[model samples]
Target: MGPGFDFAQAIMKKNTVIARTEKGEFTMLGVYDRVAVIPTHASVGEIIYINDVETRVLDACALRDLTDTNLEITIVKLDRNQKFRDIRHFLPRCEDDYNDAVLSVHTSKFPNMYIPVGQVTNYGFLNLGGTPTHRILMYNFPTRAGQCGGVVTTTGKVIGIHVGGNGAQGFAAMLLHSYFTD
Candidate 1:
């Protein structure tokens, strides 16, 4: 028979990270391997903590390229001590299952904590110069400040981090699977 559903394991395998600074705390999701992704809207400069590890905070993981477009996503660097640290794992299912999906938001301040919320209509993304974009995932849960970039999951799979959202819908981008490839 096929393997049984490992609900707990699903929660653990995600290659995710919580980017934090002295006064800055944000959510960043994993890509192909050990690299991380965050939103351009995050206000922090450097991440003082990674995976909530205080040691990693010393050298500190840095933020890299910001997408020139208004896509609102960017890459974060973790090569400082990636091998020493243990936060790498694979990611989630593809966009084929684009229904509500009821994603989970993993928070940094909590231990194995997550809040599963409403359906996500995968709008993908788009251009704003003319008619606004249709690329980001739209969710029903309205998030608060500093909760913008947290990694979300569904069926125990990592979807991506949160983006800009209003009281109505949220901005979520799908983690590019190619980034997970070597």
Candidate 2:
């Protein structure tokens, strides 16, 4: 096969994002990761691949927005410090499909990628990797709580955030900060 043409610039530039929240607005650079889904008792599936974010954004807005007649968006999982690193201590039997499913929900669009409070159920131990918790369960179901979208490197590299299972706020922020330093 011929040399693979470098599409990094096109992909990365198009992937950078801008979003507006309840109070303010901001933008960040990011690269889409693979998306996955799992059934309580079935094989994991790639329902949507990278750039599937368009549909993802629409899904998030439909679930979170209250009265945005023209709203179209998806929830971006903001990865916390503890979220990036593995920290499955004393948790339940969580399926790996959940991880892929969650990541798949991310979009490079604005707030469309941001999961609202009502959509998620932060508890003690989510069981799905993403934090350094030892007890209690906290998580968001696909239909209920959309997964947390993560932050990205300025160069468009994907930086995992710590935001699953359960953990302190500081811990989560630390994970986001890791990319800040780089």
Candidate 3:
């Protein structure tokens, strides 16, 4: 044997945070090197929809370019009372599904990662079936009200975005690699 390997140490890192206000306290994690939170009177779902209105969301992430087709635009801002499902489509792997072989491809090709709060997906997201907090769940980690923009992780890589809160089953987020690749 040449040397030992520390699988967990080889990837990115996710940092969790706790926020408290007039309501109470909750915990969340950050997936990327940079995590910024933007406050909006809207819910997390509305913000995600706004990005697709002009396809500028794709362009903002460099996945697409501008268009003059007069696409009605929805700002990527969230409302306080909006439901998480309202913006599920914008979450990566939203309706996506993969067989064991395809999942193997994703596993073999990329490092395990996490999803931080306050971020949205660039496309539909998919979940296989497993833990709620993790992206491997089936029916696409349908995060309800509280789980929006919660943090998700794998080893060190930041992968998913929480559109739900801890109290709920789970939440959704934009997969980082998917975003970068798209």
Candidate 4:
């Protein structure tokens, strides 16, 4: 086994909370102690509700080109400064290992219910028309809506944010290098 695989198992565990929007129910990754990344197909300025707590959208960015048709992935930042659960930090670039092992909690089903551990299949630009965006692909992993925006960690460090997926494959954005650095 490589270092990436071993690092992934070090992450403690995860749980989830319901995230909703005025548009109705918006899929959200699980809620962590401090910050939780979530996928927002909604544009910036939209607000999301975690259980009874309301969080405003502070910032948003697309993993793909702004003109692309595919929704791809949109990273949404929420304003929740109030004291809550433990706060999680994004992984640094040096600790990131592409094609490493990763796991995400499936909130859509049950809290801390992990969707089988998966291997990072690939990392690079995915072409959507003329614009290419950085994305990570995981194979043999089955993910659901609530898992969107959940944490994917290696060695207990968050490397990617679960965006969205189709059927068996899952898509994630590079949290440290691409999203935070951008």
Pairs of residues at least 3 apart in sequence or in different chains that clash in candidate 1:
32-179, 32-180, 124-135, 124-136, 125-134, 125-135
Which 10-residue window of candidate 1 scores lowest in summed lDDT? 56-65
lDDT tens digits by residue: candidate 1, 6-77: 432354355446666554666555453345666655534544467567523222222222442355656655
Error of 3 at 5 (Å): 19
Shift in Å, residue 169, candidate 2: 14
Q: What is the lDDT of residue 107 in candidate 4?
A: 39
In model 2, which regions exceed 4 Å deviation? 1-12, 28-57, 61-157, 161-182
Model 4: how far residue 178 lies from native, Å: 6.4
The candidate 4 region of ten consecutive residues with least summed lDDT is 7-16
| Model 3 Cα lDDT, one tens digit per residue, 1-182 | 11111212222122333332232232323223322221111222312322122111111111111332211111231222322222122234342332211010011113232222222223333231331222322223333433333333332233443433334344333343333221
RMSD of each: 5.8, 16.8, 14.3, 5.5
Put down candidate 2 lDDT per residue, 97-140, tens digits, no spaces. Answer: 11211122233433334322121222323334332232221224
Question: Local distance difference test, per candidate?
Answer: 0.52, 0.24, 0.27, 0.52
How many backbone overlaps does candidate 2 show?
34
Candidate 4 ranges beyond 4 A from true positions: 1-18, 22-36, 42-44, 61-77, 81-90, 94-100, 106-108, 127-133
Mark the regions of model 1 whose C-alpha exceeds 4 Å error after superposition. Answer: 1-14, 21-23, 43-47, 51-68, 83-97, 100-113, 125-134
Comparing 1 and 2 by lDDT, which wins? Answer: 1
The better-scoring model by TM-score among 1 and 4 is: 1
